[PDB]
Amino acid sequence: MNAPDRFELFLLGEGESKLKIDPDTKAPNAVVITFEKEDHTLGNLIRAELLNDRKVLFAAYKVEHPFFARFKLRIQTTEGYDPKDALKNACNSIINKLGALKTNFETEWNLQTL
C-alpha cells in the first residue's frame, strides 16, 4: 500500500544529482558526498581503495536509513591535495583491477574444458 515502488532504488529520480558534494564543517580538507540511488555495493570499494592510498587520511561511508538507498562518503586528504582527485584515482584503479581480472579469468575459462 504505502510501500515505495521498487524501481526507485535502482533508478535515479527527478531533480536528483547522482553526487552531491558538501565540505565538512570544522574539518580540514574534508568533504562529504551524498551518493544518490546507490547502495553498499558501490560504497565499500570506494572506502577500501581510498584507505589503500596513503594521501587519503579518512575513508568511511554510511547509510542514513536502510529504508531508502543513499550513502554518504567522507573524505579527508593531505593539504594541497584535492579530495575529488583521490576519489577518481581510487575509481580508476578499481576499473583497472576489474579489467585485469576479467582478462585473466577469460583466459582461464578458455583453458578450462567442459
Binding site: 500500500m1 504505502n2 547502495d39 553498499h40 555495493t41 565499500n44 536502510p66 529504508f67
Partner: protein, 196 residues
Amino acid sequence: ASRHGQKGTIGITYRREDMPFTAEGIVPDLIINPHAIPSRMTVAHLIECLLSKVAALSGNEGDASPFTDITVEGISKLLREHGYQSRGFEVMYNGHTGKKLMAQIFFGPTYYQRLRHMVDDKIHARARGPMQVLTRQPVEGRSRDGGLRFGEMERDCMIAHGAASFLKERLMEASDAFRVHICGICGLMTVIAKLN
C-alpha cells in the same frame, strides 16, 4: 508467528545481497532477534530448527511427537554425519561487507504461520470526519471513517501534564463543539435567539 508462541512483525525487508550469507550461499528467509527467546523459555524452537535441518538433509520426516524419547545429542550426531556443526551453529558472512561474522550464527528450517492481523488491512486515520448525530461526536470504527476515543485514563494522562488548552481544544473544538444562548433570569436554554 511460529509454533512455540513466537510472535513477530517484520520491521523491514532486506534483499538477499544485503542479508548475511552462509558459506554454501544459503541466506535465511527470515531473521529473528535473539532476546525474545530467553524470557519465553521455548527450547522446542531450537530443537525444531535442528530436527528440520536433519530432516531436510536426510530426506526423512522429522518426529515432533511429544512424549517420545528424542535426544538432542543424537540429532546433533546425525547433523555431524551430514557435515554441519552439531549445534547447528553455522559460520556466516555479513552481506554488506563480506567479512566473516565474529560470532557464528544459528539458522535452520522452521515452520512459521502467517496471521490474520495484517498491517495494511488495519491502518486507519481521520481528518474532520463523519459524526454520529445523537452525540454529535465522531462515529465508531474504521469502516465509518470514525475517530479514536479519548479514554478517561488518557484524559488524566493529559490532565497531570498541565496541557489545559490542549485538552480544551481536543475535547471542545475537535469534537461536538456547540454555541448556545442562555437568558440570565432563566439560567436555561429556553431563550429563543433569532440571529438574522
